[PDB]
């Protein structure tokens, strides 16, 4: 995965949960790709 | 002759493979004679010149056959491949071909960004570089032709920025050593597809090597003791020296009826026995020195490790006669130019010192050079450099030691050229300029403490010129009595005593 | 619910609560107090719901007071009258005849679109007629806005549009007569795979593919066949010289040193050996061609801490090129380590600068790190960028700060891990990325030269580095002609000063090619800042023509990206039956 | 017996070298200490 690190100066903005959801999209992408790389063909 | 009749030669359309085969099959003298007798080279160069003129006219407005933007780089590569023949190099050196040079240069310099894409632009740039490398190779007539052409383009440079082609051509063509083809025939084994003149196997060798190397280096890469000896087909009964460079051999061959433009020189290797005039010839002139002969360095300087020495080198090379004494050491001059494009800091002042010494005040060249140095402001630059290096200011109305020594040597050679109508040989403008600068306080600071020898040379130089004497008076101990005091303190010795006596005589 | 604000780890979270009805009721100027209710709904310490919370924190942020009075009705106008929103959509479509819309205006309308989507993310029982109208106007022109944002825009505009579209994804509490944003955004994204190799920015297509990979879970067949068709097309296009092939066989050098144009640079702090499979997070930092790195100068250093390095127009051009350089790798060494080793360092850029992306490699002996920025004083304008407490697990990656901050001084505070042994280690400074020229609109957020001289000097630097790249290519070709070409097939190729000089020439060619590419992106950025635009995707463009006329590096990056999407699509079946469409277009000859 | 292309293209897929650390040791009689320190 990636580090649990988000912009602290952007907390004054309204899109903090937007950046959070973008980052978990990225982490689920990385996890799914690693799982597809590790898994074989049944 | 039958192959000529196939591709429509007794409009026209030849692909890249067609011209590849034609350039490959034209290297023999009879084939290149048939190619020159045929009108295909003339019609192709007329076609490409018309294409260049059309593209220039279209960009500035915002037997013939139409050449497109794609075929022109392969047919320029055809020119590069056919130019191995010496009569090809003589034909490219005529006035019939020169429109090719002028058209390509005006197209790829003036006509900047019918549309020229970047990949095709790089293709034409590399093809023109290959053509220029092939043309002046071992051909002094083509060398002076390209030198005149580039001098005339730099003369008509618009008034300030230089395009990329001309800059990279300066940094490429005359900034690499000339490369010639070495052919080696020997019965003993010597240890890619080439022309069938070059033989086969390991007993026939062909190299593409720079001229500046000697025969010992190319023979190293390839009691009675067998020793390799080199022979030429035009020399009967004498070997070749091992430390003899290829420029001397090329000049000897050109003085020995070898035709000009012969791209591959041939040598036979034999085995002789050893028991345990040729080197004194002039070398090749090379395209760089030929270009610098008419002062092209000043033309390109007008259009252009401590950094101040490298900045002052560009100002120093603008004087006439600077490049002629600069080209004595080729490798270090090339290294200095490589540092300019982006021992080494000593050379831009050492060459100026040698040029001062080789240009006396009894001739017009020395006084013209001195007045041009007065006009362009080299003395101001060297004086503020000495002020910054010596941490001293002008009288307002380990590397640093070497810098100070070299600057003092430059000043000493500037005052008296013979030391390294003499009263009116130098104007009083230099006298009033040196009376303002930091020469006297820096001299008083350094004196009261090779370099001492250079300072004594500066003292006898400034005492040799009668118009430069009254600078020695301090603005109350005279310099002669002071110098006598520290000479007695020091007491090489005869030089110190003679210079101190000369300074004392000048002060009295 | 709490699920709309949970963190990536799931052990923490944060909600930003606001509403248009809040300011609508505050327009009367009467409300002053609020209540908040925490309630557990249902369909050792057995904590249920409200007792499950460990630590709580409350903050309230006020609105910015501008110089325009009676601002209440001005803010209520957009919430009451919806004809603004469609007009904003029109400013995305470039259909208005009032001139040509620049990138700055697009950034501003996308910012206010993101703000209105954020305030409409939580509408309590209110009339969603304006929300439905803006959503309908978004769905009507979704292909046009995704084309002008993800294909004809930089990293900032594409990132903001991805933020707005995924925010529209997040608040999808649609009525049963309204479809969800998923299907329609999916169809809008698959309506623009044809124009993908004619894009402009690597980060734009990166955000495009992130959104595609997320929303592809609704419909699987169309994305699969579009990806497979583009696989076949760009694969049959990419096969069309022996030069880079000879490089690949002889030295394993895959990036072409003769193609002068690239697409993006991807790097991360996390040839490939085939034995383990017998790097997934490396797409975290994309689009590093539009943004150049900076240089580091350490100013302040704490006790027991040392920063070390790990082991006349031509002069001005050379100095500007030296300012535009990747600095060598540096690091921090600590004399004495302990449980909670608090150390402090300060970095200086030398001038005010825009900071966009930051990368800190993984340090397994460090508990936490925190970075502060300031321009004039530490207590004057210091704002916190990011504090990360899991450096030992993964690397710190923060990508494309929107809005991009300006700064001159960086403060790095590091706390070591608990129970740390007294063995020395290295904390690399990482790689910092920013914008050398500060634009006037980004200067006003928090002796500046004019645009024209900066553009002229950047064009001169691009020309000089183009000359350097061309001479490097000529040297590389003339040297590479001298490689032995045996008739021994390729077995002896897989079987030295010449190798070292070829590697050095290739490294120089790659470095100058990268410099030329980012300089060209910088002058393109300055040209669109002047008022121009990049390449316009015309409606009459043949997809095969723009496939053929695309750069090879762009084709390689787009191939890796969409077959990455194909891998994720194949794994998304959860081991069930693979769809027949991508199993049918990939027949024997297609696979071969 | 010369090394052909197979040895070149399998050599990196995995000058006299030691092999004692790779192997294990044992003895037919129960000793007071194991002999792996010798390896």
From Swiss-Prot, chain A:
It is found in: Golgi apparatus, trans-Golgi network membrane; Endosome; Cytoplasm, Cytoskeleton, Spindle pole; Cytoplasm, Cytoskeleton, Microtubule organizing center, Centrosome. Transmembrane segments: none annotated. Coiled coil: none annotated. It comes from the Eukaryota. Expressed in brain cancer cells. Ubiquitinated; mediated by RNF41 E3 ligase and leads to proteasomal degradation, impairing inhibition of apoptosis. Deubiquitinated by USP8/UBPY. Autoubiquitinated; mediated by E1 ubiquitin activating enzyme UBA6. The BIR domain is essential for its anti-apoptotic function and is important for binding to DIABLO/SMAC and caspases. Anti-apoptotic protein known as inhibitor of apoptosis (IAP) which can regulate cell death by controlling caspases and by acting as an E3 ubiquitin-protein ligase. Unlike most IAPs, does not contain a RING domain and it is not a RING-type E3 ligase. Instead acts as a dual E2/E3 enzyme that combines ubiquitin conjugating (E2) and ubiquitin ligase (E3) activities in a single polypeptide. Ubiquitination is mediated by a non-canonical E1 ubiquitin activating enzyme UBA6. Belongs to the BIRC6 family. Homodimer; antiparallel. Interacts with RNF41. Interacts with DIABLO/SMAC, likely with higher affinity to SMAC dimer than SMAC monomer; this interaction blocks the substrate-binding site and inhibits the caspase inhibition activity of BIRC6. Interacts with KIF23/MKLP1, USP8/UBPY, BIRC5/survivin, MAP2K1/MEK1, RAB8A/RAB8, RAB11A/RAB11, PLK1, EXOC3/SEC6 and EXOC4/SEC8. This is Dual E2 ubiquitin-conjugating enzyme/E3 ubiquitin-protein ligase BIRC6. The chain holds residues 2562 to 2603 of 4857 of the full protein.
């Amino acid at each position: 995965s990636v580090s649990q690190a988000l912009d602290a100066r952007l907390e004054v903005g309204l899109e903090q949960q937007a950046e959070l959801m973008l980052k978990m999209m990225s982490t689920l992408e990385a996890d799914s790709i690693l799982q597809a790389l590790t898994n074989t063909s049944p | 002759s039958l192959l000529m009749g196939w591709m429509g030669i007794t409009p026209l359309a030849l692909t890249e493979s067609h011209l590849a085969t034609l350039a490959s099959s034209s290297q023999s003298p009879e084939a290149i004679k048939q190619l020159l007798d045929s009108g295909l080279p003339s019609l192709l160069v007329r076609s490409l010149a018309s294409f260049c003129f059309s593209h220039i006219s279209s960009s500035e407005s915002i037997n013939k056959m139409p050449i497109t933007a794609d075929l022109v780089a392969p047919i320029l590569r055809f020119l590069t491949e056919v130019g191995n023949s010496h009569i090809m190099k003589d034909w490219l050196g005529g006035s019939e071909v020169n429109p090719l040079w002028t058209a390509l240069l005006f197209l790829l310099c003036h006509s900047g960004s019918t549309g020229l894409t970047t990949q095709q632009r790089t293709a034409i740039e590399n093809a023109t570089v290959a053509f220029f490398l092939q043309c002046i190779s071992c051909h002094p007539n083509n060398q002076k032709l390209m030198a005149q052409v580039l001098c005339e383009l730099f003369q008509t440079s618009p008034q300030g920025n230089i395009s990329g082609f001309i800059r990279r051509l300066f940094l490429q063509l005359m900034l690499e050593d000339e490369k010639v083809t070495m052919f080696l025939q020997s019965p003993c084994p010597l240890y890619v597809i080439q022309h069938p003149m070059y033989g086969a196997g390991h007993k026939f060798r062909t190299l593409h090597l720079p001229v500046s190397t000697t025969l010992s280096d190319v023979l190293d890469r390839v009691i009675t003791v067998p020793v390799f000896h080199l022979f030429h087909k035009l020399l009967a009964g004498q070997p070749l020296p091992a430390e003899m460079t290829l420029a001397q051999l090329l000049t000897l061959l050109y003085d020995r009826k070898l035709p000009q433009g012969y791209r591959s020189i041939d040598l036979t290797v034999k085995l002789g026995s050893r028991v345990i005039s040729l080197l004194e010839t002039c070398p090749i002139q090379s395209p760089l020195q030929v270009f610098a002969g008419m002062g092209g360095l000043a033309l390109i300087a007008e259009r252009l490790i401590p950094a101040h020495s490298l900045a002052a080198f560009g100002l120093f090379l603008r004087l006439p006669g600077y490049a002629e004494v600069l080209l004595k050491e080729r490798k270090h001059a090339q290294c200095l130019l490589r540092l300019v494009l982006g021992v080494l800091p000593t050379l831009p002042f050492h060459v100026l010192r040698s040029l001062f010494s080789t240009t006396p005040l009894t001739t017009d060249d020395g006084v013209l050079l001195r007045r041009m140095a007065l006009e362009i402001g080299a003395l101001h630059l060297i004086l503020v450099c000495l002020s910054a290096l010596s941490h001293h200011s002008p009288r307002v109305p380990r590397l640093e030691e070497e810098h100070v020594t070299c600057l003092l040597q430059v000043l000493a050679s500037y005052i008296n050229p013979v030391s390294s109508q003499n009263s009116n040989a130098l104007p009083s403008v230099l006298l009033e300029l040196l009376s303002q600068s930091c020469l006297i306080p820096a001299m008083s600071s350094y004196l009261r403490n090779p370099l001492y020898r250079a300072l004594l040379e500066l003292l006898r130089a400034i005492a040799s010129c009668a118009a430069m004497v009254p600078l020695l008076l301090p603005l109350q101990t005279s310099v002669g009595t002071l110098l006598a005091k520290m000479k007695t303190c020091v007491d090489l010795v005869p030089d110190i005593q003679k210079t101190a006596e000369i300074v004392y005589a000048a002060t009295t | 619910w709490l699920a709309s604000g949970l963190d990536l780890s799931g052990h923490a979270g944060m909600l930003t609560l606001t509403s248009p009805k809040l300011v609508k009721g505050m327009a009367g100027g009467k409300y002053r107090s609020f209540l908040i209710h925490v309630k557990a709904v249902n369909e050792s310490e057995n904590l249920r719901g409200c007792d499950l919370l460990q630590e709580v924190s409350v903050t309230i942020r006020r609105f910015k007071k501008t110089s325009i009075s009676k601002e209440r009705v001005q803010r209520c106008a957009m919430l009451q009258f919806s004809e603004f929103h469609e007009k904003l959509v029109n400013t995305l479509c470039r259909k208005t005849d009032d001139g040509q819309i620049t990138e700055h205006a697009q950034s501003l309308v996308l910012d206010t679109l993101c703000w209105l989507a954020g305030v409409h993310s939580n509408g309590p029982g209110s009339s969603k007629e304006g929300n439905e109208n803006l959503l309908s106007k978004t769905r009507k022109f979704l292909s046009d806005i995704v084309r002008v944002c993800f294909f004809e825009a930089g990293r900032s505009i594409a990132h903001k549009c991805a933020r707005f579209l995924a925010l529209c994804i997040s608040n999808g509490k649609c009525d049963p007569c309204q479809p969800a944003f998923g299907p329609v955004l999916l169809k809008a994204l698959l309506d623009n795979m044809s124009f993908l190799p004619a894009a402009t920015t690597g980060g734009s297509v990166y955000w495009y593919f992130v959104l595609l990979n997320y929303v592809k879970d609704e419909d699987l067949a169309g994305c699969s066949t579009a990806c497979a068709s583009l696989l076949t097309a760009v694969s049959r296009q990419l096969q069309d010289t022996p030069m880079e092939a000879l490089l690949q066989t002889r030295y394993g050098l895959y990036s072409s040193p003769f193609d002068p144009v690239l697409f993006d640079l991807e790097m991360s702090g996390s040839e490939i050996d085939l034995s383990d499979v017998l790097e997934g997070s490396f797409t975290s930092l994309t689009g590093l061609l539009e943004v150049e790195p900076l240089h580091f100068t350490c100013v302040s250093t704490s006790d027991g801490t040392r920063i070390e390095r790990d082991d006349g127009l031509a002069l001005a051009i050379s100095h500007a090129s030296h300012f535009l350089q990747p600095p060598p790798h540096q690091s921090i060494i600590i004399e004495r380590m302990h449980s909670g080793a608090r150390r402090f360092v300060t970095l200086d850029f030398g001038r005010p600068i825009l900071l966009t992306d930051v990368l800190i490699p993984t340090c397994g002996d460090l508990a936490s790190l925190s970075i502060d920025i300031w321009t004039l004083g530490e207590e004057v304008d210091g704002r916190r960028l990011v504090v990360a407490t899991d450096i030992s697990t993964h690397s710190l990656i923060l990508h494309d700060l929107i809005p991009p901050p300006v700064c001159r001084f960086m403060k790095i505070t590091v706390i070591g891990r608990y129970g740390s042994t007294n063995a020395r280690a290295k904390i690399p400074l990482g790689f910092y990325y920013g914008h050398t020229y500060i634009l006037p609109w980004e200067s006003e957020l928090k002796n500046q030269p004019e645009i024209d001289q900066h553009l002229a000097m950047m064009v001169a630097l691009q020309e000089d580095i183009q000359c350097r790249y061309n001479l490097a290519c000529h040297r590389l070709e003339t040297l590479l002609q001298s490689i032995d070409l045996p008739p021994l097939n390729s077995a002896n190729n897989a079987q030295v000063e010449e190798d070292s000089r070829v590697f050095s020439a290739y490294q120089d060619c790659i470095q100058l090619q990268l410099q030329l590419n980012l300089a060209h992106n910088a002058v393109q950025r300055l040209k669109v800042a002047l008022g121009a635009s990049r390449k316009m995707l015309s409606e009459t463009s043949n997809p095969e023509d723009l496939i053929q006329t695309s750069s090879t590096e762009q084709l390689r990056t787009i191939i890796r990206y969409l077959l990455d999407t194909l891998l994720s699509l194949l794994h998304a079946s959860n081991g069930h039956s693979v769809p027949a469409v991508l199993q049918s277009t990939f027949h024997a000859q297609a696979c071969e | 017996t010369a090394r052909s292309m197979v040895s070149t293209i399998m050599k990196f897929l995995d000058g006299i070298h030691n092999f004692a650390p790779l192997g294990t040791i044992t003895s037919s009689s129960p000793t007071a200490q194991p002999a792996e320190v010798l390896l």
